[PDB]
Design a protein around this ligand. Structure first.
Ligand code: HEM
Ligand SMILES: CN(C)c1cccc2c(S(=O)(=O)NCCCCCCCCNC(=O)[C@]34C[C@H]5C[C@H](C[C@H](C5)C3)C4)cccc12
Ligand SMILES: [K+]
Length: 404
């Protein structure tokens, strides 16, 4: 517990630990939802993780994401040292400089790219699932959720399949840390992999994402090598743990809810809506911002340099915006969430991510309509900037399945 700053009133202190919240055993969204109990104010200060604010309600979360002038992305992670070291593009930039970098990134992971990749996304899902189907078991996180998005990235980035276990090694070191290296070191090791590739594709561009970013123009001039690297690191990591962990949450839920599986089998037209309602219920990101100036917000004095956690996760779980928020209803009306963020940094990958989710749901239930959690296994969640599932052992009777 860091010393409480004298500008912070004691009545706003609530020592939530985003990397190890109490009651994690109840589920990680449930653990974060403690922040929305009736005796917790809308904006609190936690002394954990160096000390920082947390906005606990959708209205404040969206407001702060809109107000980039006060709430800057230059240090967007807790703890401060990680946020300081972090320099990916565009996530560590504010508008207006951010806008042209975001437009360049949009050309390589935005919507039209989706239609070009869609046949490979479909084929990859089907091939992975058929490999598992006859076995009657898998560790879903390891056997489907991890290989699916990284294979898609390698295709969009024009990288060879054999590079996958090394890239995985490198991203795990960053995003699945064990305290052996600092964020800065893991980040540099990732940059070491990308720097030669960007050099190569600046001399000899192709039509892959790295070539397009590395040869782009921004605010009137060519992008530098360093800018390209910082963009490519985000394009790699952006759709990896988010998708891995979101799919895992979704499949845990479906494994525990035969009635919702049957619903999507009998009414496949509801799968897009189901995707949105799972994105709401199993929202999983929590990053934040740094104050650019002293600012009073919702009656609370914020100080220049204070960090504020703005959990994307919480908006859709807020009872003030969605009734019975922990309940999953594929027929829910007025589904609201900020799962993909809000404001100037609203996820560029969201159309790709929804395609990945919808293809998985449809192709999984087509071949393996009936499955359960392995008997006896205790599913464990993890919490942090991207919350997730540690492992997801599933079982089924292969006689209930079909090759398609
Ligand atoms: C379920 C999956 C995903 C979730 C929940 C998710 C969530 C988010 C969130 C919350 C942000 C905003 C962060 C900020 O405001 O600080 C964001 C930004 C972004 N994400 Fe996604 N993401 C997902 C998938 C992907 C995928 C598949 C990619 C593809 C490479 C991707 C690319 C990006 C990029 C480039 C940005 C930065 C946009 C900018 O800063 O203007 N995302 N994502
Ligand atoms: C107990 N031990 C094990 C530990 C516990 C806790 C911290 C530890 C750290 S730490 O404190 O240095 N690491 C905590 C922050 C790690 C940042 C990961 C995000 C980077 C990639 N993602 C994004 O860019 C994005 C950017 C954006 C938001 C979000 C989703 C998408 C889009 C991708 C993230 C170091 C070592 C050990 C630690
Ligand atoms: K920084």
């Amino acid at each position: 517990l860091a010393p409480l700053p004298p500008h912070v009133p004691e009545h706003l202190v609530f020592d939530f630990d985003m990397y190890n919240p109490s009651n994690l055993s109840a589920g990680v969204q449930e653990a974060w939802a403690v922040l929305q109990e009736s005796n917790v104010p809308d904006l609190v200060w936690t002394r954990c993780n160096g000390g920082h604010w947390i906005a606990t309600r959708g209205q404040l979360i969206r407001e702060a994401y809109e107000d980039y002038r006060h709430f800057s992305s230059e240090c967007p992670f807790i703890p401060r040292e990680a946020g300081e070291a972090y320099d990916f593009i565009p996530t560590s930039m504010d508008p207006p400089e951010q806008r042209q970098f975001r437009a360049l990134a949009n050309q390589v992971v935005g919507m039209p790219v989706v239609d070009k990749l869609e046949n490979r996304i479909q084929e990859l899902a089907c091939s992975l699932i058929e490999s598992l189907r006859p076995q009657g078991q898998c560790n879903f996180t390891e056997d489907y959720a991890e290989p699916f998005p990284i294979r898609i990235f390698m295709l969009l980035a024009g990288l060879p399949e054999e590079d996958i276990p090394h890239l995985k090694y490198l991203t795990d070191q960053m995003t699945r840390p064990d305290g052996s290296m600092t964020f800065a070191e893991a980040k540099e090791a990732l940059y070491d992999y990308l720097i030669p590739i960007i050099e190569q594709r600046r001399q000899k561009p192709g039509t892959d994402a790295i070539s397009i970013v590395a040869n782009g123009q921004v605010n009137g001039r060519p992008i530098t090598s360093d800018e390209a690297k910082r963009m490519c690191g985000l394009l790699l990591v952006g759709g990896l743990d988010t998708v891995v962990n979101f799919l895992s949450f979704s499949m845990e839920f479906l494994a525990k809810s035969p009635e919702h599986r049957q619903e999507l089998i009998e009414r496949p037209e509801r799968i897009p809506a189901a995707c949105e309602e799972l994105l709401r219920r199993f929202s999983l990101v929590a990053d934040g911002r740094i104050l650019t100036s002293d600012y009073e917000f919702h009656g609370v004095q914020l100080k220049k340099g204070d960090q504020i956690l703005l959990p994307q996760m919480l908006s859709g779980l807020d009872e003030r915006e969605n009734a019975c928020p922990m309940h999953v209803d594929f027929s829910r009306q007025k589904v609201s969430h900020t799962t993909f963020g809000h404001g100037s940094h609203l996820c560029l990958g969201q159309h790709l991510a929804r395609r990945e989710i919808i293809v998985t749901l449809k192709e999984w239930l087509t071949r393996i309509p009936d499955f359960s959690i392995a008997p006896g296994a205790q599913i464990q969640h993890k919490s942090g900037i991207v919350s997730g599932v540690q492992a997801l052992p599933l079982v089924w009777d292969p006689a209930t399945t079909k090759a398609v």
